[PDB]
Amino acid sequence: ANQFNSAIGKIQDSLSSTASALGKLQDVVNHNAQALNTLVKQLSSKFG
Amino acid sequence: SMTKTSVDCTMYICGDSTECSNLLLQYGSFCTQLKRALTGIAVEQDKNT
């Protein structure tokens, strides 16, 4: 009970201080946002 | 893993002329997507190692 409660408290302190562990899910936001922002810039170029 | 490659649109399409580089910028983001796709292959080939 000293080992298990202190190990789960280090998980809660790491996710609050550092957001870099969730950055695999942040790329799922980022790869969908950069695909939409590139597709809407196709109308500005003249295509010849 | 596979062989990591990178393809430029400038030296491949154009023969180093000023007319080809002016008509390449009218097409816009066609070579923006191709350079970011071959970059994203080469990051994931190092993650396989």
Q: Read off the amino acid at residue B27.
A: Y
| Structure-block tokens of residue A45 | 């170029």
| Residue A23 to residues A18, A29, A30, B1, Cα–Cα distance (Å) | 10, 10, 10, 24
| Structure-block tokens of residue A14 | 């790491």
Cβ burial, residue B24 (10 Å; 0-12/13-18/19+): middle
| Structure-block tokens of residue A40 | 């809407």
Cα dihedral sign, A17-A22-A27-A29: negative
Q: Provide the shortest C-alpha distance from residue A33 to chain B (in Å).
A: 14
Question: Cβ of B29 and A46 within 8 Å?
Answer: no
Contacts of A32-40 with CB under 8 Å at 24 or more apart are A38/B29, A38/B32, A38/B33
Q: Which residue of A has its CA nearest to B31?
A: A38
DSSP track, A2-46: HHHHHHHHHHHHHHHH--GGGHHHHHHHHHHHHHHHHHTTTTTS-
Question: Cβ of B26 and A41 within 8 Å?
Answer: no
Phi, psi of A15, deg, nearest 5: -75, -25
